Enzyme design. Structure first.
Site, PDB file in Angstrom:
ATOM      1  N   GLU A   1      -5.965   8.639  -0.415  1.00  0.00           N
ATOM      2  CA  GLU A   1      -5.874   7.470   0.500  1.00  0.00           C
ATOM      3  C   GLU A   1      -6.803   6.333   0.094  1.00  0.00           C
ATOM      4  O   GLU A   1      -6.401   5.202   0.201  1.00  0.00           O
ATOM      5  CB  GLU A   1      -6.267   7.867   1.904  1.00  0.00           C
ATOM      6  CG  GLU A   1      -5.686   6.933   2.914  1.00  0.00           C
ATOM      7  CD  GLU A   1      -4.182   6.988   2.842  1.00  0.00           C
ATOM      8  OE1 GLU A   1      -3.669   8.112   2.811  1.00  0.00           O
ATOM      9  OE2 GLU A   1      -3.542   5.911   2.810  1.00  0.00           O
TER      10      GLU A   1
ATOM     11  N   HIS B   1       0.826  -1.203   0.000  1.00  0.00           N
ATOM     12  CA  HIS B   1       0.000   0.000   0.000  1.00  0.00           C
ATOM     13  C   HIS B   1       0.861   1.255   0.000  1.00  0.00           C
ATOM     14  O   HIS B   1       0.623   2.180  -0.783  1.00  0.00           O
ATOM     15  CB  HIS B   1      -0.921  -0.012   1.217  1.00  0.00           C
ATOM     16  CG  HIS B   1      -1.792   1.198   1.341  1.00  0.00           C
ATOM     17  ND1 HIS B   1      -3.080   1.240   0.854  1.00  0.00           N
ATOM     18  CD2 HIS B   1      -1.569   2.402   1.917  1.00  0.00           C
ATOM     19  CE1 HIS B   1      -3.609   2.421   1.115  1.00  0.00           C
ATOM     20  NE2 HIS B   1      -2.714   3.146   1.760  1.00  0.00           N
ATOM     21  N   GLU B   2       1.871   1.300   0.872  1.00  0.00           N
ATOM     22  CA  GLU B   2       2.725   2.474   0.980  1.00  0.00           C
ATOM     23  C   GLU B   2       3.608   2.660  -0.244  1.00  0.00           C
ATOM     24  O   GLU B   2       4.027   3.787  -0.526  1.00  0.00           O
ATOM     25  CB  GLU B   2       3.588   2.379   2.236  1.00  0.00           C
ATOM     26  CG  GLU B   2       2.895   1.706   3.404  1.00  0.00           C
ATOM     27  CD  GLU B   2       1.604   2.401   3.795  1.00  0.00           C
ATOM     28  OE1 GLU B   2       1.540   3.644   3.695  1.00  0.00           O
ATOM     29  OE2 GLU B   2       0.649   1.704   4.194  1.00  0.00           O
TER      30      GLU B   2
ATOM     31  N   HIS C   1       1.793   5.006  -2.510  1.00  0.00           N
ATOM     32  CA  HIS C   1       1.969   6.388  -2.073  1.00  0.00           C
ATOM     33  C   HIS C   1       3.352   6.903  -2.441  1.00  0.00           C
ATOM     34  O   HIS C   1       3.512   8.072  -2.811  1.00  0.00           O
ATOM     35  CB  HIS C   1       1.749   6.499  -0.567  1.00  0.00           C
ATOM     36  CG  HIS C   1       0.316   6.393  -0.154  1.00  0.00           C
ATOM     37  ND1 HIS C   1      -0.637   7.309  -0.541  1.00  0.00           N
ATOM     38  CD2 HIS C   1      -0.324   5.486   0.619  1.00  0.00           C
ATOM     39  CE1 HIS C   1      -1.805   6.967  -0.028  1.00  0.00           C
ATOM     40  NE2 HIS C   1      -1.642   5.864   0.679  1.00  0.00           N
TER      41      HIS C   1
END
Lengths: 1265, 49, 48
Positions: free
Chosen positions: A265, A226-227, A230
Site C-alpha cells: 500500500e 493509485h488503484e 494495484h
C-alpha cells in the site's frame, strides 16, 4: 492507439461493449441473488459498472455502521447510485477521469499496460484458454450467454462513498505470479481532502494568494491512478500481504487504533513513506516472482503448441525468449519491468507527471471532512488540466484548495471516535490525535530464509538496474492494442478459493486511567469551543493548565509573553494608532518568541532544540521537570517518545549449498553466489530493522509534530479571538473598522507564517533525533546476529572448499579461500542514502526553497535584452537612451542619467507591498568615480517607488541612501562610502516590518533602523529606475540583477545570496568583473599601492628584471589623495593557445608585459630569491607558465600568482621585495618567493598583502586625466 | 572535449547505444532493439569555431 | 544531481527519446518536463 468509448447509461446493450454481467464473486454466499449489472467496456478489457461495490465481506453492508469506526473521514450513504440519473453521472465522471488519465503519455502507457497484461490463462490441449479468473459472464434469464475478456472491472464506491479500493478475484493467482482479475471501487465525485500545512517547505500555492489554510483536495485522476497500480500488481502476480504494519499495540495504551497497513500500500502510494520500505518489499517480491515465473514458464508456458492471441498477450506481458516448446524467462528485462511496475509506477510519480499535489504521507495525521465536487462541470474540472485550470496565470496547485467554491462541503454523519483519558471532568480526546505506534512484532513471523545456493541463482541487484523511466519510453503496446476480444461461450472452471481481504477491525471504546497530566491534557487546555462568542467574552491567555482546563474563557499559553501584550490592554481602544501599535507588537512578540531555539554544539549532532515544547507539550517533565533542552541531552529519544520498542529479529539460520557431481566453472559460481547471497541477507536484515524503525519510531515523531501543530495553531487562534474581540470594542471611532479588519487579517497571515517557521524548526530537530536513533541504537543490535550468521556461512563455505578442491585446482582453491576469508569476516555498511528524511535532500535545494522561491522581480540582461529574469512581470518599459554595458557576469544595465534613460516597471500585485509585508531589495551597483565637482551635496535618486509616500534608493556624494516614507514617519539609512569607487557592490536591504530594516553592503551589515512606526508605503506609480535631480548630464551608473523578494532575508540568507554570485571560480579584477584572456591589465600589488610593473635590463647579468615603478597619486575633486591605479606598464594575460575565455581559479597563464613573456629563471644562475625576469634578454632560459590562484575567498578582487616548479626553483607565490642588490639604485624587485607558498596558510592576514595582485583594467568611470 | 568521438547513451537504456539508422531514405538516429548486427557510431561535439 | 549527463536543449525544448514504435526509440525534440524540480531521465544523455 487505445480508444476510450464514449458511452451513455441509456445505450442499448450491444453484447460486445454494453452487457449485463454476472458479478465475478457470485459464488460467495453473501452475493447469492445479486443480479446482473450493466457494464460498459470503456477500454479493451476494462469495464465500468456503475453500481456500489458490495461483494466482499468488508463492503457487504452500505448503511451507517451504528458504531464508531477507525476512519475520521468517511461518508455513509446507502441510497447513492440507486437511480439511473446518478448512475449516468457516475459513468460520465469515470469516463472523464479515464480520458484525463489518457491525456498524458504516462497515463496512456499505464492504461495500455493494464489493458494488455492479462492473467496467465490455463492450458488445454496445448492451447491457452480463458477462465473465470479473466472473464466476466454476460447473462440473460439466469443463463450465462457469453464470457467476455476483462482485465479490470470498475464499480462505484463501497459503504464509504469517498473511499477507494482494489480487490483481487482469486487468492493464489495474486501471489504465485499467475495474475488475476481486479475489481476497483472508487467515487470520482466524493473526495477526501488532505491537510498539507507543515510538510512541504516548497510553496504549494501562489506567493501572493493570501491563502488562509493550505488544505487541498485530491485529484480524482490521481485517486484512480493509485488503484491502477494495484491492478497492475494483481495482474502480474505481485501482491503479497505478509509485509504489513500491525497497528494494534496494547502496552502503550495510547495508540491510534488503525487497520493494518500493507507494505504494498505504501509502495503503491510512493513518496516519503515508500522510501523506508521500498527496498525490502521490492527485493522480496522480485526475488519470489522470478522463481514463480520461472516455474510457470517451465511447466505451463512450455506445454503450449498453439499460437492463439492469448499467447501473444502472454509473450508481450512476460518478457520470455526462445521458441515454441522452449521458453526461458530472460531475467534482465524481467527484473527491469518488475522494478518499473513496483518502483517507478506509483501515485506520487504519476501525480507529479500530471501536475497534481499529493499528501507526502499515506497516513492522515490531520484528516479532513470529505467533500463533494461535480467534475462534470467543465468550468471546474477539465480533462486537459484538471482542477488547476491555468487561467490568467499559472495556478500551481491553486485549484486544489478546498475553498474554491466548487468543493461542496458535506457534514459527516460518521460517529465520532474518541478515547476517554479519564484520570484518578475528564478529557475525551479524538482517535485521530492518538500516537501512531505500530506493533513491535509486525515484521516477525517473516520468512527471512533462502533455499540451497545453487549455480545461476542470479540474486536481484537493485543497484545494477538502469535508472527510472516514468514515461515508460520502452515497452511498446501496439502489438497488444490490436488484439480483439475473444468472448468465448464456455470457459475452464479453475476451481480456486475466492480472495477475501482483511476484515477491518471494529473500533473499541476504552478508557485510560493516568496519574499525571499527559500531552493530550496540554493540547485540550489550549482549546476553546466555537460556541464561545468572540465578543462579550475575552479569552485571556494564561500560564497554568489547570486554570485553562476548568475555565472556558482562558487559554493556556506557555509563551508567557504574548499574554502580556494580549492581556493588560484596556478594552475600548480609543484610536487606530493604538490598534496598529498593539497589532505590530503582537506580531513581533509572537514571531520572535516562537523562533526561540537552543543550538547545542555536540559535533555532527548540533541539535537546534526549540525549548518551548517543554511547557507546550508535557514531554520532558517526567525525566527533568522544568527543563526540556537539558532533558534531551540525558535521553535523546527516550524523552521525546512514549515507546521505545526494544526490537527483535529472527534467529537467522546460516545458508547452505547443494551437493552433487559439480564442475569447477560452476562450483566457483556457487561460491560467488553464496557470497552475494550473504551480502543481500545483510542488506535485507538492515532493511527489516529500518522498516521497524519507520513503523514504530518515525510515526511517533510524525504524531508529535501533529501535536505541536495543534498547539501552535490553537495559540494563534486564541490570539485571533482576542484581536477580533478588541475590534468588536472599537469605541474610539465609528465606521473606521474596515481598515482595522484588513490589518487583523494580514496579522493572522503573519502569525501563520511564524507558526510554520516554528514547525519547520521543530521538524528539523526531531527528524535528526530519530535518524540518529536509527543509526546508533538499532543497527548495532542487528549486527551481532548478522555476524553469527556470517560466521556460520563462512564455516559452511570453507567446508565446501575442502571437498571439491580437486575439481577446482590448487590456484582456484586458494583464490576462493582467500575471497571467502576476507569477505566473510567484515561488517557490511548500512546504506542510508535512501533514508526517508535526509539532510542532503534539505540542502541540495536550500537556495531554491529559501531565496529564489520568493523572488517577484529580477531585472537583468539576457541575450542582449533587458528583462525580468524571474518572469513574474513583462510590463517593464525602458527608455530610448538606456544601454547595456559589460558587467559582473552578463551585460549590465547602464542608466545614462539623461532624463530619457528612464526604466519603469508598472506595479502589479506582486510588487505591491502592504503594511505588514516584509520585503527585500538586492542589487549590484557600479557607480563611476566623480570626474568633476558639480554634483556634491545634491542627492539624486537611483530607483524610486515614491509618490510622497513609499521607498526610494538615492545616491548622495559617494553614499547610498535608503528611504522609507509613510504618511508621517520615515527612515533614512546611509551606506558609509566607497559606492562611487567604481566597484561592483551588492547592496541588499531587508525590511522586516515588525522589527526593523537592515542594510547590507557586500553581505556585511551596515545599519538597522526601527521600522515599526511605518505603516503604508504602497503607491500605484511604477517602480522608476532613473537618475533625476542629477546636475551632471554625463553621469551614469551600472546596475545588475536588481531583484525584489517578498521575505526578509536574515544574515544567513543574505550571505548565502552573496556567495551565490561567486559560484563560478572566475578570477576577479579590481572592479569585480571576471578576468579575460586577451585584455591588457595594469598590475599592482595590494601592498605598495600606486606602483605598477615595469622592466629594467641588467647587461652585466643579462637579465630583464620586473620592478614596481615609481609611485604616483591622483587628486580627487574633493581634494583627497589616493594611490593611482593606471601606473606602469600594461601586462597582457595570455594562454598557451589563446583560448580567449575567462580566467579561472587554477588556470595556467602567461603574463606578457610590453610584448615580452614573464617567467622565472630555468637554471642555477638566479639562486638568490628567484627574481622574476622577462623573455627580453636571451642569455638565460625562463619557465614562463605562471598560475593564477585565489587561496582567499572567491569574491576578493585580487589574485595570487603561483610560479612554476622547475627543478632549479621551488614553487612560490609572486611577491615583491624592496632591495638594492648591487650598485644600481634602490628598487622593488618582483620575485617568486618560494617561502610564502610553502607556509601560506600559517601566515597571518597582514603578510598575505605581500602576495596579492590587483590586475587593474582601464575602465570608464575611473579615470585620472 | 570538442572534436573527440564518444558513444552516446540515453542514461535510461545504457545497454543500447544510440546508432544512426540508414535502412531508410530519411536517415535519423535511434536506439535499436533488434541488435542482430552490432556496429557502433561515434558522436562528437563540434562548434563552428 | 546527475553530473555525468548532458541536456541538448534548444529554446525550451530538450532532446528526448520517443516511445517505442517499431523496436526503435527514435530521438525527437520535446518540451522539457520536470520531476522533483528536475527534468526526466530521458532528456539526459551520456558520452562514453
Amino acid at each position: 492507439k487505445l480508444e476510450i468509448n464514449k458511452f451513455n447509461y441509456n445505450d442499448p446493450i450491444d453484447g460486445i461493449n454494453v452487457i449485463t454481467m454476472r458479478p465475478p464473486r457470485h459464488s460467495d454466499k453473501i452475493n447469492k441473488g445479486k443480479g446482473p449489472f450493466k457494464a460498459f467496456q470503456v477500454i479493451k478489457n476494462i469495464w465500468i459498472v456503475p453500481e456500489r461495490y458490495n461483494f466482499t465481506n468488508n463492503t457487504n453492508d452500505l448503511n451507517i455502521p451504528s458504531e464508531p469506526i477507525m476512519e475520521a473521514d468517511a461518508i455513509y450513504n446507502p441510497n447513492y447510485l440507486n437511480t439511473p440519473s446518478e448512475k449516468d453521472e457516475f459513468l460520465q465522471g469515470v469516463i472523464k477521469v479515464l480520458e484525463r488519465i489518457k491525456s498524458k503519455p504516462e497515463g496512456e502507457k499505464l492504461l495500455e499496460l493494464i489493458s494488455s497484461s492479462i492473467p496467465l490463462p490455463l492450458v488445454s490441449n496445448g492451447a491457452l484458454t480463458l477462465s473465470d479468473n479473466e472473464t466476466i459472464a454476460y447473462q440473460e434469464n439466469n443463463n450465462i450467454v457469453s464470457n467476455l475478456q476483462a482485465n479490470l472491472v470498475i464499480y462505484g464506491p463501497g459503504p464509504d462513498i469517498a473511499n477507494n479500493a482494489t480487490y483481487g478475484l482469486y487468492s493464489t493467482p495474486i501471489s504465485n505470479g499467475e495474475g488475476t482479475l481486479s475489481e476497483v471501487s472508487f467515487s470520482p465525485f466524493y473526495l477526501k481532502p488532505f491537510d498539507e500545512s507543515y510538510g512541504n517547505y516548497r510553496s504549494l500555492v501562489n506567493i501572493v494568494n493570501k491563502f488562509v489554510k493550505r488544505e487541498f483536495a485530491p485529484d480524482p485522476a490521481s485517486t484512480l491512478m493509485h488503484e491502477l497500480v494495484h491492478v497492475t500488481h494483481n495482474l502480474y502476480g505481485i501482491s503479497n500481504r505478509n509485509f504489513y504494519y500491525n497497528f494494534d499495540t496494547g502496552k502503550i495504551e495510547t495508540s491510534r487504533q488503525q487497520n493494518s497497513l500493507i507494505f504494498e500500500e505504501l509502495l503503491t502510494f510512493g513518496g516519503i513513506d515508500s522510501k523506508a520500505i521500498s527496498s525490502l518489499i521490492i527485493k522480496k517480491i522480485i526475488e519470489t516472482a522470478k522463481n514463480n515465473y520461472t516455474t510457470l514458464i517451465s511447466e505451463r508456458l512450455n506445454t503450449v503448441t498453439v499460437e492463439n492471441d492469448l499467447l501473444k498477450y502472454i509473450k508481450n506481458k512476460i518478457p520470455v525468449q526462445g521458441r515454441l516448446g522452449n521458453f526461458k524467462l530472460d531475467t534482465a528485462e524481467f527484473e527491469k519491468k518488475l522494478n518499473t511496475i513496483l518502483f517507478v509506477l506509483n501515485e506520487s510519480n504519476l501525480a507529479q507527471r500530471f501536475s497534481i499535489l499529493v499528501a507526502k504521507h499515506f497516513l492522515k495525521e490531520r484528516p479532513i471532512d470529505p467533500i463533494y465536487v461535480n467534475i462534470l462541470d467543465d468550468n471546474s474540472y477539465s480533462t486537459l488540466e484538471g482542477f488547476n485550470i491555468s487561467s490568467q496565470g499559472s495556478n500551481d496547485f491553486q485549484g486544489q484548495l478546498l475553498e474554491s467554491s466548487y468543493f461542496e462541503k458535506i457534514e459527516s454523519n460518521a460517529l465520532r471516535a474518541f478515547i476517554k483519558i479519564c484520570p484518578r471532568g475528564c478529557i475525551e480526546v479524538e482517535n485521530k490525535d492518538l500516537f501512531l505506534i505500530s506493533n513491535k512484532d509486525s515484521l516477525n513471523d517473516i520468512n527471512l530464509s533462502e533455499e540451497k545456493i545453487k549455480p545461476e541463482t542470479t540474486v536481484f541487484f537493485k543497484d545494477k538496474l538502469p535508472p527510472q523511466d516514468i514515461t515508460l519510453s520502452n515497452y511498446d503496446f501496439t502489438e497488444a492494442n490490436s488484439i480483439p476480444s475473444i468472448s468465448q461461450q464456455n470457459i475452464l472452471e479453475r476451481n480456486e478459493e475466492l480472495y477475501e481481504p482483511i476484515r477491518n477491525s471494529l473500533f473499541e471504546i476504552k478508557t485510560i486511567y493516568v496519574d499525571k497530566l499527559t500531552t493530550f491534557h496540554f493540547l485540550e487546555a489550549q482549546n476553546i469551543d466555537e460556541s464561545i462568542d468572540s465578543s462579550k467574552i475575552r479569552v485571556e491567555l494564561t500560564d497554568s493548565v489547570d486554570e485553562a482546563l476548568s475555565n472556558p474563557n482562558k487559554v493556556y499559553s506557555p509563551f508567557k509573553n504574548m499574554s502580556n501584550t494580549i492581556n493588560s490592554i484596556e478594552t475600548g481602544i480609543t484610536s487606530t494608532y493604538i490598534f496598529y501599535q498593539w497589532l505590530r507588537s503582537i506580531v513581533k512578540d509572537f514571531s520572535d518568541e516562537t523562533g526561540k531555539i537552543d543550538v547545542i554544539d555536540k559535533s555532527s549532532d548540533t541539535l537546534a532544540i526549540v525549548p518551548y515544547i517543554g511547557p507546550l507539550l508535557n514531554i520532558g517533565n517526567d525525566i527533568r521537570h522544568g527543563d526540556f533542552v537539558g532533558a534531551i541531552e540525558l535521553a535523546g529519544i527516550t524523552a521525546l517518545l512514549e515507546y521505545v520498542p526494544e526490537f527483535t529479529i529472527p534467529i537467522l539460520v546460516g545458508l547452505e549449498v547443494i551437493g552433487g557431481e559439480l564442475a569447477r566453472e560452476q562450483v566457483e559460481a556457487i561460491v560467488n553466489n553464496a557470497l552475494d547471497k550473504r551480502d543481500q541477507k545483510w542488506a535485507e536484515v538492515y532493511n527489516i530493522t529500518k522498516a521497524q524503525w519507520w513503523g514504530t519510531i518515525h510515526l511517533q515523531i510524525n504524531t508529535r509534530l501533529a501535536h505541536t501543530y495543534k498547539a501552535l495553531s490553537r495559540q494563534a487562534n486564541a490570539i485571533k479571538m482576542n484581536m477580533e474581540f478588541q475590534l468588536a470594542n472599537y469605541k474610539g471611532n465609528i465606521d473606521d473598522k474596515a481598515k482595522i479588519k484588513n490589518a487583523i487579517s494580514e496579522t493572522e497571515i503573519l502569525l501563520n507564517k511564524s507558526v510554520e517557521q516554528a514547525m519547520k524548526n521543530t521538524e528539523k530537530f526531531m527528524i535528526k533525533l530519530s535518524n540518529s536513533y536509527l543509526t546508533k541504537e538499532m543497527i548495532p543490535k542487528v549486527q551481532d546476529n548478522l555476524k553469527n550468521f556470517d560466521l556460520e556461512t563462512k564455516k559452511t563455505l570453507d567446508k565446501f572448499i575442502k571437498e571439491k578442491e580437486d575439481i577446482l585446482g590448487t590456484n582456484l582453491s586458494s583464490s576462493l579461500r582467500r575471497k571467502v576469508s576476507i569477505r566473510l569476516n567484515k561488517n557490511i555498511a548500512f546504506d542510508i542514502n535512501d533514508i526517508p528524511f535526509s539532510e542532503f535532500d534539505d540542502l541540495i535545494n536550500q537556495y531554491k526553497n529559501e531565496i529564489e522561491d520568493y523572488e517577484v522581480l529580477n531585472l537583468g540582461a539576457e541575450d542582449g535584452k533587458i528583462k525580468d529574469l524571474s518572469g513574474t512581470t513583462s510590463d517593464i518599459n525602458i527608455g530610448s537612451d538606456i544601454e547595456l554595458a559589460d558587467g559582473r557576469e552578463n551585460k549590465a544595465i547602464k542608466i545614462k542619467g539623461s532624463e530619457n534613460s528612464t526604466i519603469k516597471i508598472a506595479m502589479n500585485k506582486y510588487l505591491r507591498f502592504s503594511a505588514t509585508d516584509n520585503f527585500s531589495i538586492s542589487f549590484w551597483i557600479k557607480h563611476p568615480k566623480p570626474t568633476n565637482l558639480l554634483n556634491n551635496g545634491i542627492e539624486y535618486t537611483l530607483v524610486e517607488n515614491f509618490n510622497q509616500r513609499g521607498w526610494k534608493i538615492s545616491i548622495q556624494d559617494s553614499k547610498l541612501i535608503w528611504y522609507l516614507r509613510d504618511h508621517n514617519n520615515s527612515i533614512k539609512i546611509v551606506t558609509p562610502d566607497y559606492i562611487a569607487f567604481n566597484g561592483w557592490n551588492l547592496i541588499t536591504i531587508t525590511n522586516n516590518r515588525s522589527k526593523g530594516s537592515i542594510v547590507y553592503v557586500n553581505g556585511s551589515k551596515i545599519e538597522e533602523k526601527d521600522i515599526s512606526s511605518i505603516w503604508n508605503t504602497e503607491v500605484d506609480d511604477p517602480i522608476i529606475f532613473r537618475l533625476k535631480n542629477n546636475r551632471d548630464t554625463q553621469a551614469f551608473t551600472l546596475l545588475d540583477q536588481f531583484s525584489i523578494y517578498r521575505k526578509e532575508l536574515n544574515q544567513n540568507e543574505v550571505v548565502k545570496l552573496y556567495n551565490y554570485y561567486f559560484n563560478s571560480n572566475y578570477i576577479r579584477d579590481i572592479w569585480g568583473n571576471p578576468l579575460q584572456y586577451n585584455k591588457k591589465y595594469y598590475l599592482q600589488t595590494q601592498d605598495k599601492p600606486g606602483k605598477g610593473l615595469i622592466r629594467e635590463y641588467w647587461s652585466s647579468f643579462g637579465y630583464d628584471y620586473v620592478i614596481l615603478s615609481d609611485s604616483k597619486t591622483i587628486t580627487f575633486p574633493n581634494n583627497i589623495r589616493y594611490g593611482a591605479l593606471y601606473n606602469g606598464s600594461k601586462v597582457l594575460i595570455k594562454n598557451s593557445k589563446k583560448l580567449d575565455g575567462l580566467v579561472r581559479n587554477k588556470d595556467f597563464i602567461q603574463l606578457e608585459i610590453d610584448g615580452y613573456n614573464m617567467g622565472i629563471s630555468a637554471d642555477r644562475f638566479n639562486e638568490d630569491t628567484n627574481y622574476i625576469g622577462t623573455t627580453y634578454g636571451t642569455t638565460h632560459d625562463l619557465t614562463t607558465d605562471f598560475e593564477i590562484i585565489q587561496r582567499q575567498e572567491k569574491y576578493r578582487n585580487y589574485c595570487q600568482l603561483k610560479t612554476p616548479y622547475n627543478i632549479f626553483h621551488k614553487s612560490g607565490l609572486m611577491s615583491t621585495e624592496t632591495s638594492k642588490p648591487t650598485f644600481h639604485d634602490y628598487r622593488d624587485w618582483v620575485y617568486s618567493s618560494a617561502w610564502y607558498f610553502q607556509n601560506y596558510e600559517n601566515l597571518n592576514l597582514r603578510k598575505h598583502t605581500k602576495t596579492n595582485w590587483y590586475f587593474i583594467p582601464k575602465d570608464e568611470g575611473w579615470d585620472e586625466d | 572535449k570538442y572534436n573527440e568521438n564518444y558513444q552516446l547513451y540515453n542514461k535510461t537504456s545504457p545497454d543500447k547505444e544510440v546508432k544512426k539508422v540508414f535502412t531508410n531514405d530519411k536517415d535519423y538516429i535511434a536506439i535499436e532493439y533488434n541488435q542482430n548486427t552490432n556496429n557502433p557510431t561515434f558522436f562528437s561535439l563540434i562548434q563552428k569555431e | 544531481n546527475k553530473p555525468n549527463s548532458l541536456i541538448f536543449s534548444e529554446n525550451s525544448q530538450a532532446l528526448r527519446l520517443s516511445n517505442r514504435l517499431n523496436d526503435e526509440n527514435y530521438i525527437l525534440l520535446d518540451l522539457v518536463s520536470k520531476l522533483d524540480d528536475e527534468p526526466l531521465n530521458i532528456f539526459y544523455w551520456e558520452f562514453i
